[PDB]
Design a protein around this ligand. Sequence first.
Ligand code: SO3
Ligand code: SO3
Ligand code: SO3
Ligand code: SO3
Lengths: 65, 68
Amino acid sequence: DCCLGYTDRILHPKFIVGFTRQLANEGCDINAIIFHTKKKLSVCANPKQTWVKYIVRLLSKKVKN
Amino acid sequence: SNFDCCLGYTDRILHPKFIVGFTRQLANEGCDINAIIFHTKKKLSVCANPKQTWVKYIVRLLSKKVKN
Ligand SMILES: O=S([O-])[O-]
Ligand SMILES: O=S([O-])[O-]
Ligand SMILES: O=S([O-])[O-]
Ligand SMILES: O=S([O-])[O-]
């Protein structure tokens, strides 16, 4: 459903297969990055955190290449 | 469980404003072809060709939005 809290975890860049962005803007109350992982589970993350931004850029660069 | 594979690419062109995320399918992780799977809020995803400029663009746009 909507993320209400953010993980304390710091994910490995190779453990994620993608992500979704949740905006306070659409149905949910807060903004979140939802990482989709190789365990076919999703992890809710703080959009402002340096690791979250970094993983997302590593993934999109991989696609660019 | 195993990831259900895209076996081919959509012809549809979805406006990027409806795309809320993506997952990348890699042939080197077991499926037969590479794909980008675009997610929408209505939980209907579409399978896209990673080689296409349009596809790489939308993916980069999604990341730049996260950057801020
Ligand atoms: O298949 S990756 O390069 O999007
Ligand atoms: O449906 S499209 O935007 O690959
Ligand atoms: O999720 S895998 O098949 O790249
Ligand atoms: O595992 S696949 O790339 O034939």
